[PDB]
Ligand binder design. Structure first.
Ligand SMILES: [Ca+2]
Lengths: 37, 49
């Protein structure tokens, strides 16, 4: 996606902005961003 | 910035009290995820977020 967006893993096509990483909410499909943080 | 099209509004419950006694839900269609700024253009009601 965009330079300022990170996808919720390769297995999913959804991409979210990097500001949502480790915000305390499961913004991904199954909370991939909140993992290993 | 995201583009929001075909946005219509509705209110679930309301109770005019000193707290934030009221919830409203917004429906829309967008192209990409992001964060938007939300504001009430009137004076009768004040938002929280
Ligand atoms: Ca998150």
């Amino acid at each position: 996606c965009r330079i300022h967006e990170i996808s919720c893993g390769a297995h999913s096509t959804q991409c979210i902005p990097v500001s949502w990483r480790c915000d305390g909410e499961n913004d991904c499909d199954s909370g991939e961003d909140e993992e290993n943080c | 910035a995201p583009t929001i099209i075909d946005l219509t509004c509705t209110v679930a419950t309301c109770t005019h009290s000193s707290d934030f006694g009221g919830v409203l839900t917004l429906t829309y269609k967008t192209d990409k995820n992001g964060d938007c700024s939300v504001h009430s253009h009137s004076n009768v009601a004040t938002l929280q977020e």
